Design a binder for this molecule. Structure first.
Ligand SMILES: Nc1ncnc2c1ncn2[C@@H]1O[C@H](COP(=O)(O)OP(=O)(O)O)[C@@H](O)[C@H]1O
Ligand SMILES: Nc1ncnc2c1ncn2[C@@H]1O[C@H](COP(=O)(O)OP(=O)(O)O)[C@@H](O)[C@H]1O
Ligand SMILES: [Mg+2]
Ligand SMILES: [Mg+2]
Lengths: 375, 375
């Protein structure tokens, strides 16, 4: 709801202020194409990795506080918002251009047959999407590369939740192999020690301790991971000795997840800023190239002189516009592309378009970050 | 007290039954010398490794339930039993032949000046000895190799206790370097998470979790370590939310330490058994060598034939005495030593002496293990 206003504000600011400066200097043919409305309406995703019978399917029902189609308390499920409670098989989901699952077609039927999108109107899903994963075992035989599909979600997911069972902590080689496939994205990982009320207090310490022991043994990062310890479902507690703990841990978890759409808003706001800066540089470059072109003859001779002297051009522009060499595009990649452009057809500099962007960066953004601040 | 009877029983059984079979065939000149009474009166030792201000000195006062000389709540201290409360500086301790600290002389004054033996009549010390260690810091500058002296205690100690502070868990590089020096003896290690009542329940989980995380990150062993979580001193509890836990953990700790003298008794009982078996083999070998020697001439010629055919002798004896080739001494090491012996001066086989040992192994040991069983 509130972050749908943020989404609208970003799209608006981009189309009114940034996009015209990209189109004026063919930004989209050099670097990246125009941003579609899909680039803005992204809800942060969560990947649930956990062995069989850990409680992932219940964990989802616990957050949503509601059932979802084809939940059945094994395959991949993408739980997302939807006007009506419905289910979409994977073979059809990977064709939907309004879904991030279009690239998943590379794994094929053996995977698609074990892939589904369950939709339902639920508050949680208005803000984020949950991707359940098949329960890892503790033999093997899947007609798709299970460790590569897991890897693929991890790179496009905002949060990864390793799920472990305090009643039966049995980290398997397959699970460990999956965790080693998530490395390089440890900041996305959190852990959940479920069914904590099933064991007595001493046993919880042995299990929880043996968990961290073997995790750090695997991830080999000085940055210890966060483990939310509790019993995550609607049922009563068995071993109430740590009731207060399990409740604070659940609140710490709800706060983590509830922050994801906010963190995403900022990430998008920063990406829009960086894009708007790159567009400025691109406009200053093309403009200078146009400025120097002769009024009539020696056009192809001047074009090649500019391309060869492009490194000097960069420094020329950095100084007379106080801009960083960091948001400049790579020198050689430009030169390779500037070969294919009639320099004389470029547009002279349009101060009207740059002012529109600089007025966005100085004034218009301070308010959005204020709209994000009001959680 | 009770394990002083075990000590006496072992010494008695060795002197009455084993030692005469070793002396009859010069066992002590080939393999290992006669066992002194010191070889039996060993009390298991404990090495306390822990950073500064963790509470080691209090931890010791907690177990003993009593002060000890020069405790001062930094240097090595060997807390051991003693008729009277006294203190012995290190420069004099390393000269005492009735102390295992005679080899420590290799590190010298810079270490000896930071080494002491505090004695006192205390029940705990009748059974075991505690070796406090200087508090590791969290700079460096000691005039002795701190990581080599620690290593030296670890190899002769029965139990190593890593001590950590839940109020300020700051594993330092020096401490980690020490823990890496204990590897290869992980079975001796236990951990103690002290001051657990100082933090709230959630913070305990973060600290305890971060501990195991970085420990397994260091020791790299699939065998997770045991961490006794509590507040180990006579004072009341601050955060009573986990009173029951901290009490069971302390009892689990007292049971671990209280078992050490029993485990040692068994280790000695097994070592005596293995020695008595090796003595038998040695007696059968020397006897056979004597048996084959000619009654008069060709003595040096026969001696060399036997030594060369000694591998065949081993198999000859293994079969006609149903004994394992495992407790046989190395073939070549014997041959190198059998050069220096007038074979004709050996003694013929003495069935009287072997029966004395076999009667010890069949009958006399079943009772000692019963004396150990009665904890
Ligand atoms: N918080 C909990 N405490 C104890 N048992 C639970 C809890 N949550 C789920 N379970 C049990 O664990 C089983 C596994 O549930 P499910 O989530 O379907 O498996 P998976 O997590 O592998 O999808 C269920 O039968 C349920 O009864
Ligand atoms: N169980 C405990 N809980 C809280 N504080 C403690 C506990 N035991 C000791 N302390 C405090 O920690 C400090 C360090 O004590 P000491 O054992 O002398 O240091 P070290 O362990 O480095 O020898 C002491 O001043 C004491 O007040
Ligand atoms: Mg599931
Ligand atoms: Mg101390």
């Amino acid at each position: 709801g509130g972050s749908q206003t943020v989404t609208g504000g970003l799209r608006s600011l981009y189309q009114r202020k940034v996009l015209p400066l990209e189109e004026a200097y063919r930004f989209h043919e050099f670097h990246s194409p125009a941003l579609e409305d899909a680039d803005f309406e992204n809800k942060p995703m969560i990947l649930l990795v956990g062995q069989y019978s850990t409680g992932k399917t219940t964990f989802i029902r616990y957050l949503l506080e509601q059932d979802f189609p084809g939940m059945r308390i094994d395959s991949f499920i993408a739980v997302m918002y939807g006007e009506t409670e419905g289910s979409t098989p994977g073979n059809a989901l990977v064709v939907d251009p309004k879904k991030p699952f279009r690239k998943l077609s590379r794994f094929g039927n053996a995977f698609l047959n074990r892939f589904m999108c369950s939709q339902l109107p639920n508050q949680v899903l208005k803000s984020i999407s949950i991707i359940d994963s098949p329960g890892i075992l503790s033999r093997i035989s899947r007609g798709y590369d299970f460790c590569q599909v897991l890897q693929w979600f991890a790179e496009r997911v905002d949060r990864i939740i390793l799920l472990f069972d305090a009643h039966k902590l049995d980290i398997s080689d397959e699970f460990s192999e999956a965790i080693k496939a998530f490395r390089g994205q440890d900041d996305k990982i959190r852990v959940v020690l479920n069914k904590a009320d099933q064991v007595d207090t001493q046993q919880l310490m042995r299990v929880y301790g043996a968990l961290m022991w073997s995790l750090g043994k695997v991830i080999n990062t000085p940055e210890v991971l966060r483990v939310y310890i509790g019993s995550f479902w609607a049922q009563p507690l068995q071993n109430t000795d740590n009731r207060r703990l399990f409740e604070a841990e659940a609140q710490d978890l709800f706060r983590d997840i509830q922050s994801l759409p906010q963190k995403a808003a900022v990430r998008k706001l920063n990406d829009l800023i960086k894009r708007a800066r790159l567009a400025k540089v691109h406009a200053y470059i093309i403009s200078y190239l146009k400025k120097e072109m002769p009024n009539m003859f020696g056009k192809e001779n001047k074009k090649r002189e500019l391309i060869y002297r492009l490194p000097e051009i960069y420094v020329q522009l950095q100084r007379e516009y106080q801009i960083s060499a960091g948001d400049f595009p790579e020198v050689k990649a430009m030169q390779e592309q500037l070969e294919n452009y009639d320099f004389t057809k470029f547009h002279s500099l349009k101060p009207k378009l740059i002012e529109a962007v600089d007025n966005m960066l100085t004034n218009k953004i301070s308010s959005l970050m204020g709209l994000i601040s009001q959680e």
